[PDB]
Design an enzyme around this catalytic site. Structure first.
Site, short mmCIF file in Angstrom:
data_model
loop_
_atom_site.label_atom_id
_atom_site.label_comp_id
_atom_site.label_asym_id
_atom_site.label_seq_id
_atom_site.Cartn_x
_atom_site.Cartn_y
_atom_site.Cartn_z
N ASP A 1 35.14 31.71 7.92
CA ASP A 1 36.09 30.70 7.47
C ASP A 1 36.80 30.08 8.66
O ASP A 1 37.24 30.77 9.58
CB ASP A 1 37.11 31.32 6.53
CG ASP A 1 36.51 31.74 5.21
OD1 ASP A 1 35.52 31.11 4.78
OD2 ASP A 1 37.03 32.69 4.59
N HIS B 1 39.03 26.97 7.93
CA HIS B 1 40.24 26.58 7.21
C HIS B 1 41.11 25.60 8.00
O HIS B 1 42.33 25.74 8.08
CB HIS B 1 41.05 27.81 6.79
CG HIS B 1 40.68 28.35 5.44
ND1 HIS B 1 39.94 29.50 5.28
CD2 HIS B 1 40.95 27.90 4.19
CE1 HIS B 1 39.77 29.73 3.99
NE2 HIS B 1 40.37 28.77 3.31
N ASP C 1 34.59 26.95 3.51
CA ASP C 1 36.06 27.06 3.53
C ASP C 1 36.63 26.64 4.88
O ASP C 1 37.24 27.43 5.61
CB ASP C 1 36.52 28.47 3.15
CG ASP C 1 36.87 28.60 1.69
OD1 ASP C 1 36.48 27.72 0.90
OD2 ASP C 1 37.55 29.59 1.33
N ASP D 1 41.11 23.57 3.99
CA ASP D 1 42.48 23.69 3.54
C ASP D 1 43.23 24.69 4.40
O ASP D 1 42.64 25.41 5.21
CB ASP D 1 42.56 24.12 2.07
CG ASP D 1 42.07 23.05 1.12
OD1 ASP D 1 42.19 21.85 1.46
OD2 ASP D 1 41.56 23.40 0.03
N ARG D 2 44.55 24.73 4.19
CA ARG D 2 45.47 25.65 4.86
C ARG D 2 45.37 25.53 6.39
O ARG D 2 45.13 26.50 7.11
CB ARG D 2 45.24 27.10 4.41
CG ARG D 2 45.10 27.25 2.90
CD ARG D 2 46.47 27.23 2.21
NE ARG D 2 47.35 28.39 2.45
CZ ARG D 2 47.03 29.68 2.32
NH1 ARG D 2 45.90 30.07 1.76
NH2 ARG D 2 47.91 30.59 2.71
N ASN E 1 34.88 27.84 -1.72
CA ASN E 1 35.59 27.51 -2.94
C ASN E 1 36.67 26.46 -2.71
O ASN E 1 37.00 25.70 -3.63
CB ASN E 1 36.18 28.75 -3.60
CG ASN E 1 37.23 29.46 -2.76
OD1 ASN E 1 37.65 29.00 -1.70
ND2 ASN E 1 37.74 30.55 -3.31
N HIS E 2 37.24 26.42 -1.51
CA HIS E 2 38.24 25.41 -1.18
C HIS E 2 37.65 24.01 -1.12
O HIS E 2 38.41 23.04 -1.09
CB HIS E 2 38.91 25.73 0.15
CG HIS E 2 40.02 26.73 0.04
ND1 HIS E 2 41.32 26.37 -0.22
CD2 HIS E 2 40.02 28.08 0.15
CE1 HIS E 2 42.08 27.45 -0.26
NE2 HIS E 2 41.31 28.50 -0.04
N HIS F 1 29.43 32.50 0.72
CA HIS F 1 30.87 32.44 0.93
C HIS F 1 31.58 33.60 0.25
O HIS F 1 32.23 34.42 0.91
CB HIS F 1 31.43 31.11 0.41
CG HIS F 1 32.92 31.06 0.42
ND1 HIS F 1 33.67 31.34 1.55
CD2 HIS F 1 33.82 30.78 -0.56
CE1 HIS F 1 34.95 31.22 1.27
NE2 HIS F 1 35.07 30.88 0.00
N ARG G 1 42.46 36.64 -8.75
CA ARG G 1 42.46 35.29 -8.20
C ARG G 1 42.40 34.21 -9.27
O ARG G 1 42.55 33.03 -8.93
CB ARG G 1 41.27 35.11 -7.25
CG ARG G 1 41.58 35.36 -5.79
CD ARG G 1 40.38 35.02 -4.92
NE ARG G 1 40.67 35.14 -3.50
CZ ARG G 1 40.19 36.09 -2.71
NH1 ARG G 1 39.39 37.04 -3.18
NH2 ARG G 1 40.52 36.10 -1.42
N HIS H 1 35.54 35.72 2.94
CA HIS H 1 36.49 35.32 1.91
C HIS H 1 37.87 35.95 2.02
O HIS H 1 38.80 35.44 1.38
CB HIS H 1 35.91 35.62 0.52
CG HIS H 1 36.52 34.80 -0.57
ND1 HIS H 1 36.66 33.44 -0.48
CD2 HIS H 1 37.02 35.16 -1.78
CE1 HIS H 1 37.23 32.98 -1.58
NE2 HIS H 1 37.46 34.00 -2.38
MN MN Z 1 38.86 27.82 3.98
MN MN Z 2 37.00 31.27 0.53
#
Ligand code: MN
Ligand code: MN
Lengths: 83, 293, 74
Positions: free
Chosen positions: B56, B58, B84, B87-88, B116-117, B166, B213, B240
């Protein structure tokens, strides 16, 4: 190819403690009455007595998973002899 | 046509590496070529050895640049990213733009999976939509990047023996042929095989369970062992959860968590790591710190 | 941790498990003196308890055979 005579031969072999030949002729009678087990064997050939004798023959030849499978066959499942 | 697009895309790589955002028409053309190059790609893309699998990101762009300074430059070492990367993080559009431009430049050297993001709702709620409005100005570039996330392949296979995805496994997936039979051309649902593919996670359990989740499941060592035995696999690589050491060998040397975003959300202080499968499937771990700022 | 690490590798022995659960609960009950024998029955001395048996409805099994009707051990 006469199932009753094969049952008689299997019973005579079972009475004389010949379990392998008795199992052979019981299987042979089942193969006569049903088309090599393509359809279900009628209950007038494999009766509960006949299946119980087959179970005894498998048990005295030391084949125990076959005893469990063959005692699933009964009208009431004989769990005690299976276990 | 090939030469001018190749040199323009190389200049795009060079402008991205110095952390400059592109224009809307350039992103249009990049996304269109990305759509064309990702249409002809299966759900389980076979990636031949050697390959350096990364986890990841991110949206931590300087950490991505450090990652390229550790594992090697993108022309020279193969990469496999398990999604992923959107995001973040403060610099989100630069990260995804760099990955997609590297994909369409080097089609056998960069493999990109889906996280998933990387869906419309999650990008809308967790920051990519806001980053889209603050940098480029309107929400249209978010539309191209969501379609681009829509076409991305789900999983990958390394020498028929390592399965990289992922999230985690699925109660509805039993064979890898079912992964190849899924309709990938849709946004990730709330229930189904693919949501579990991108959302599930291992835990020290004895069976399945509801993941904490809101989506996906959780699986134990028995499930992973059954999946590895029934499919001829020996390793399941995934990215993840946040890990301090950057790698985890859970489910008894069968499931491998590889997190490659050091100091996640800039406040956790984790030392990330990536895996480097050589040509002999003869691996090593590159473990690194966050970049100076 | 003990809930998520359960393995279903036993027999359907409902009576012994039910007796064990009741033995735990009534054991602490008679330890605390919550039930005053001889002095009547005081429903204010109360230790509320609900036990939930999650099973499948298969045949009751012992090491000797199937048991038709559920008998708690005495
Ligand atoms: Mn991510
Ligand atoms: Mn993820």
């Amino acid at each position: 190819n006469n199932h009753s005579w094969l049952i008689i031969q299997a019973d005579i072999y079972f009475a004389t403690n010949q379990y392998s030949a008795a199992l052979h002729y019981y299987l042979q009678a089942g193969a006569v009455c049903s088309d090599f087990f393509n359809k279900a064997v009628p209950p007038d050939v494999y009766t509960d007595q006949v299946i119980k004798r087959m179970i005894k023959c498998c048990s005295l030849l030391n084949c125990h998973t076959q005893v469990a499978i063959l005692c699933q066959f009964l009208r009431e499942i004989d769990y005690k002899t299976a276990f | 046509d090939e030469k001018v697009f190749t040199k323009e895309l190389d200049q795009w790589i060079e402008q991205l590496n110095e952390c400059k955002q592109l224009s809307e028409s350039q992103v249009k053309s990049l996304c269109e070529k990305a759509k064309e190059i990702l249409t002809k790609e299966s759900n389980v893309q076979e990636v031949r050895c050697p390959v350096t699998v990364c986890g990841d990101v991110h949206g931590q762009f300087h950490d991505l640049m450090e990652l390229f300074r550790i594992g090697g430059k993108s022309p020279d070492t193969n990469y496999l990213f398990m999604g992923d990367y959107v995001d973040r993080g403060y610099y989100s559009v630069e990260t995804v733009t760099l990955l997609v431009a590297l994909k369409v430049r080097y089609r056998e050297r960069i493999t990109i999976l889906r996280g998933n993001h990387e869906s419309r709702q999650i990008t809308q709620v967790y920051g990519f939509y806001d980053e889209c409005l603050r940098k480029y100005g309107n929400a249209n570039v978010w539309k191209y990047f969501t379609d681009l996330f829509d076409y991305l392949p789900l999983t990958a296979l390394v020498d028929g023996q390592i399965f990289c995805l992922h999230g985690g496994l699925s109660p509805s997936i039993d064979t890898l042929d079912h992964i190849r039979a899924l309709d990938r051309l849709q946004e990730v649902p709330h229930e189904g095989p693919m949501c579990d593919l991108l959302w599930s996670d291992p835990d020290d359990r004895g069976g399945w369970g509801i993941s904490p989740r809101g989506a996906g499941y959780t699986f134990g060592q028995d499930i992973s062992e059954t999946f590895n035995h029934a499919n001829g696999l020996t390793l399941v690589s995934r990215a993840h959860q946040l890990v301090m050491e950057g790698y985890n060998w859970c489910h008894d040397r069968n499931v491998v968590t590889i997190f490659s975003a050091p100091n996640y959300c800039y406040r956790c202080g984790n030392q990330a790591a990536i895996m480097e499968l050589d040509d002999t499937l003869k691996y090593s771990f590159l473990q690194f710190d966050p970049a100076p700022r | 941790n003990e809930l998520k690490n359960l393995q279903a590798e036993g027999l359907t022995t409902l009576g012994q498990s039910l007796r064990t659960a009741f033995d735990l609960l009534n054991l602490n009950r008679l330890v605390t003196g919550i039930d005053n024998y001889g002095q009547g029955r005081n429903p204010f001395f109360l230790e509320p308890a609900i036990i939930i048996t999650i099973t499948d409805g298969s045949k009751l099994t012992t090491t000797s055979g199937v048991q038709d009707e559920l008998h708690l051990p005495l």
